[PDB]
């Protein structure tokens, strides 16, 4: 599932930058894909009765770590300081050749 | 340790496709190794007083995302929909040159 | 943030082997960086009201899996058996070209 509730916590699946309706990427850019990832994540969090501010942990998996800065600049707009606990690294590849995938854990 | 209990949760280590008693891979194949990972994982879960059905989050680390389609269909037999929250990506390499590693978090 | 508290749990950000005050790597060695990661990690756990012995889950992201052995040696000194649940893999790259990143979850 996209999200699972356990007690105080909610666990979200790794989110790709897809249009919720179509299942296709919003574009090829890491910028649009990142933005879309954060938007989708917001939708899923709020559906679970959480929100951006109740997120306690995130993991950002990147296709290219060189995008780190711009990704971050987008990320910071959704998770401003104080931001959740975070880990970031470059993977060999992501599903559907995505540019970015973000997973997270939040409180209820 | 293979699993650590904390309140309502149990955290499992990343699991490779090894025959538990011998420490060796079931084969050099992703199919066999995935199936084995899921078996071992099951036994650890039930040893902790959990089970496949109480798993809230999983992470699948692959050596090759071409296997992702096969892996999925094996995975689906152990985690039928609605399945746990999940993240999947391809790493540079796994311990002991494994084809697949899976970690998870479950409820007690 | 470096650590987020949620009920019985605390979530730590991925930790690099940096001199905390200066933000610069302790060295370019994986050995020194591993040791430093673990120390910093201890600081962040203690400042949060937790400790090494209350850590329930770790994730070790390596730049080169050949370092595994020595890393695990160093790691073993900070998390002696019985040690936390753990996943380990090699990533394509880490932030600031680090040799090792370690994230963790502990109890309060």
Author numbering:
A (entry chain C), B (entry chain A), C (entry chain B): 80 to 187
Show sentences the authors wrote:
Arabidopsis thaliana RidA (AtRidA) is targeted to chloroplasts. By converting the reactive enamine/imines to harmless 2-oxoacids, RidA preempts damage to BCAT3 and ensures that the isoleucine biosynthesis can proceed. In this study, we determined the crystal structures of apo-AtRidA and its complex with pyruvate, and analyzed its structural basis for ligand recognition. The RidA domain retains the basic overall fold, and also preserves the homotrimeric structure with the characteristic interfacial clefts.
Therefore we tried both 2-oxoacid products for cocrystallization studies, and we obtained the complex structure of AtRidA bound by pyruvate. The structure was obtained by soaking the crystals of the apoprotein with 20 mM pyruvate for 1 hour, and the resulting crystals diffracted to 2.3 Å. The crystals did not appear to have decayed, but the crystal space group became P1. After structure determination, we found that there were three monomers present in the asymmetric unit. The three monomers within the asymmetric unit form the trimeric barrel, which is almost identical to that formed by the apoprotein, with an RMSD of only 0.27 Å. Pyruvate binds to the interfacial cleft formed by two subunits, but makes specific hydrogen bonds with only one subunit. The carboxylate group of pyruvate forms the salt bridge with the NH2 and NE atoms of the guanidino group of conserved R165, while accepting another from the OG atom of T167. Additionally, O3 of the carbonyl group receives another hydrogen bond from the backbone of T167. Aside from these polar contacts, the ligand is located at the active site formed by F147, L95 and P174. Additionally, the terminal carboxylate of E180 from the neighboring subunit is only 3.26 Å from the 2-carbonyl group, and hence it is very likely to play a role in the recognition of the intermediates.
